[PDB]
């Protein structure tokens, strides 16, 4: 393909002054030695390609980002709907993949996978028609609904999606909605110009919330649900690569960690894996 | 209208498909793109950059900087192995946490030649020579300079130039090797033995230090994307 890898031109014996093996890293330069410089090699036509490791093919796979549950019963109206400030730090599998790059600019596909489970107790439902969920997106500053059966579920401007159960998972696309020119994954700075407030990327995260509710009162019985959101970035560009994270995450608004070792442990410095008897090489 | 027939595989949700989708907010005006320096067009542009290799990660060394330093002394020697480790850039205690292994563990297959750069961090007056051998997986790992000098080996002299890139070639019977290797796709061993020894003038430090580097050559390739067995969690992070 267009990502084809370089071929090895053949090479015979040599006796020269141009030593390609000897270099000097103090210049901060990774050597470009192909195996043809330290031994005799043969002309092979290498047909391997690097398509599977481009950025778009490396990131264009949906991964879970949130897991919220909610009821349709009565009382404690904080349980009839679910809230989520849009973050990409609560599920680790995707956070670590994003934290290899400093800046990111992309579009996005969002697919919602909702599963509903009936709840125990007396006065069960016997038969219940299909359920219907509403998923309203509230930009930063919109009127937040306080419970189900509230005025703000009109969504006269907010993008809202209605999904009856028993239908293909819902999906819509969102363009690059950042304020700046790239989603800053890291922000070494403060919020107030007096160097106080909230330190970290927690201040750049202004994307709004996502609210979900049942449009069905039911009356006869309780039925919980489980909302699962999936992010799939496409048309993606990345800048300023980073070293991958080592210590496990602890908080969803910080980079905090605990000091962990650099790798696992071997038995000795010169331990090839097998069990060795004592001697003047391995001891 | 037009008569259709729903094929198997409808109403399903594949995570790695390429479908169009209606946009939530139409006619959105996106902010312009500016030329931020350092665009990454492919992940091998990251995997081709050197990174230090903790080859001294034995017992209580992983909780210090000592994991990165190889101790060398200037005694008789000639009978001592400086270091030996398998060639397993995906599953090995040596360089699974380097820059190369972290990108590798995101995949299942790999291929191509891997470089190894050795830097001498001794005094300015200390000389010496070393034999950096690589053995293909045909027999047991070498144990004296005799049995190691046969395989692919380079001889390294320290001078004004303080680096020698032992370039481990790609010798295998499969076009790709598994990341989490086994007996079948084993790759071999990499050792390093004294050839003359450290000689220092009076007043110089008798012991020196070598660091190891690792990167992928310009024929490296990768396939079969997967999730990394390196990061985990229990519940949501709040």
């Amino acid at each position: 393909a267009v990502a084809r890898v370089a071929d090895t031109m053949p090479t015979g014996p040599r006796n020269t002054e141009s030593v390609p093996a000897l270099t000097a890293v103090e210049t901060g330069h990774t050597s470009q030695v192909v195996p043809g410089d330290t031994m005799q090699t043969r002309h092979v036509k290498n047909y391997h390609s690097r398509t599977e490791s481009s950025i778009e093919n490396f990131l264009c796979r949906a991964a879970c980002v949130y897991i919220a549950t909610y009821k349709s019963a009565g009382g404690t109206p904080t349980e009839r709907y679910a809230s989520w400030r849009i973050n990409t730090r609560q599920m680790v599998q995707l956070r670590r993949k994003f934290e290899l790059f400093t800046y990111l600019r992309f579009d996005m596909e969002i697919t919602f996978v909702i599963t509903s489970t009936q709840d125990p107790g007396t006065q069960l439902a016997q038969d219940m028609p299909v359920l219907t969920h509403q998923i309203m997106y509230i930009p930063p500053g919109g009127p937040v609904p306080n419970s189900a059966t509230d005025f703000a579920w009109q969504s006269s401007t907010n993008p809202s999606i209605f999904w009856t159960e028993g239908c293909a998972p819902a999906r819509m696309s969102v363009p690059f909605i950042s304020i700046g020119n790239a989603y800053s994954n890291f922000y070494d700075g403060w919020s107030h110009f007096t160097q106080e407030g909230v330190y970290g990327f927690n201040s750049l995260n202004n994307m709004g919330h996502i609210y979900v509710r049942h449009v069905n009162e039911q009356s006869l019985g309780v039925s919980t649900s489980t909302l699962r959101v999936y992010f799939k970035p496409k048309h993606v560009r990345a800048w300023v690569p980073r070293p991958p994270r080592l210590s496990p995450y602890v908080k969803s608004s910080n980079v905090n960690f605990k000091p962990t070792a650099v790798t696992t442990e071997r038995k000795d410095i010169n331990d090839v894996g097998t069990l060795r008897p004592v001697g003047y090489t391995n001891h | 209208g037009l008569p259709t027939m729903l094929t198997p595989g409808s109403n399903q949700f594949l995570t790695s498909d390429d479908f169009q989708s209606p946009s939530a907010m139409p006619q959105f005006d996106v902010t312009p793109e500016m030329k931020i320096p350092g665009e990454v067009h492919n992940l091998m542009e990251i995997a081709e950059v050197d990174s230090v290799v903790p080859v001294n990660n034995t017992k209580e060394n992983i909780n210090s900087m000592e994991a990165y330093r190889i101790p060398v002394t200037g005694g008789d020697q000639l009978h001592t192995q400086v270091f030996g480790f398998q060639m397993q850039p995906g599953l090995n205690s040596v360089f699974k946490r380097t820059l190369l292994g972290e990108i590798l563990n995101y995949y299942a297959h790999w291929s191509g030649s891997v470089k190894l750069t050795f830097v001498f961090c001794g005094s300015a007056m200390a000389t010496g020579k070393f034999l950096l051998a690589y053995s293909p997986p045909g027999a047991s790992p070498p144990q004296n300079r005799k049995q190691a000098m046969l395989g692919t080996h380079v001889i390294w002299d320290v001078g004004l130039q303080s680096s020698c890139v032992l370039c481990i070639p790609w010798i295998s019977q499969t076009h790709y090797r598994l990341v989490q290797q086994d007996e079948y796709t084993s790759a071999g061993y990499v050792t390093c033995w004294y050839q003359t020894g450290l000689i220092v003038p009076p007043g110089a430090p008798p012991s020196c230090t070598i660091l190891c580097f690792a990167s992928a050559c310009n024929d490296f390739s990768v396939r079969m994307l997967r999730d990394t067995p390196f990061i985990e969690q229990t519940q949501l992070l709040q």
Partner: antibody, heavy 112, light 114 residues
Framework: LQQSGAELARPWASVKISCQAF???????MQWVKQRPGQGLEWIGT????????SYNQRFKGKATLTADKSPSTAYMQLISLTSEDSAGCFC??????????WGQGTLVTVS | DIVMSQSPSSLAVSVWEKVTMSCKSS????????????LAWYQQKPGQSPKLLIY???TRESGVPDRFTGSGSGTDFTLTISSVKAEDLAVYYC?????????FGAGTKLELKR
């Protein structure tokens, strides 16, 4: 190989045992073995000379401390907090990673 | 820890009787670099310091007869005593070169029967 014939020690105290021979230090470590009539031979530890390494058996870690300097041609082993269980014949041996070879005579340590 | 078993722990035998004695290891004292078992055989004469009998589990020492011969491989060994004489009544200890704690075997006491 020369080792002193016997040592008389008071319990809850230390003993320093010496070993000395024509052999020099190339790749040969110094082995120390504790021999008691009721039981078999028990290894205490060794001290190789090429890397100047010191090794002790878990059982004897904290009980046996052994030191050797190049000039005396003598290897030493010290034991502390002696009890009747330490009364035994202690042998020093050589090892060129080829065999345990020979030991020689020993100190009949008596804790009395 | 690698332990060394000895069986029988002791046996009394008369003159001119071929005796053996097994020393079985809890781990195969044979490495695949040179294929040389790491086992040592030792004779401690009654009230005497021990001496070498068989090193590399295969080779004899000087001043030692063919009634002392190493034999075996892997994790099980024995020392064939072909024609016993009046200098074999003693205790014999096997030993391993492989694991750092150099534990000796139980100790066979070849007894003399008159």
């Amino acid at each position: 190989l020369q080792q002193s014939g016997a040592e008389l020690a008071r319990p809850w105290a230390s003993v320093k045992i010496s070993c000395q021979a024509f052999y020099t230090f190339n790749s040969y470590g110094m082995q120390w073995v504790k021999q008691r009539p009721g039981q078999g031979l028990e290894w205490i530890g060794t001290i190789y000379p090429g890397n100047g390494q010191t090794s002790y058996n878990q059982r004897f870690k904290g009980k046996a401390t052994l030191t050797a300097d190049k000039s005396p041609s003598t290897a030493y082993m010290q034991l502390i907090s002696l009890t009747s269980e330490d009364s035994a014949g202690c042998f020093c041996a050589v090892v060129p990673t080829v065999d345990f070879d020979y030991w020689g005579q020993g100190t009949l340590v008596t804790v009395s | 820890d690698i332990v060394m078993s000895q069986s029988p722990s002791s046996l009394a035998v008369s003159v001119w009787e071929k005796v053996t004695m097994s020393c079985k290891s809890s781990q195969s004292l044979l490495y695949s670099n040179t294929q040389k078992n790491y086992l040592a055989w030792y004779q401690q004469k009654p009230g005497q310091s021990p001496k070498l009998l068989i090193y590399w589990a295969s080779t004899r020492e000087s001043g030692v007869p063919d009634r002392f011969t190493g034999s075996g491989s892997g994790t099980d060994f024995t020392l064939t005593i072909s024609s016993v004489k009046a200098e074999d009544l003693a205790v014999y200890y096997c030993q391993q070169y492989y694991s750092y704690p150099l534990t000796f075997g139980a100790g066979t006491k070849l007894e003399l029967k008159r």
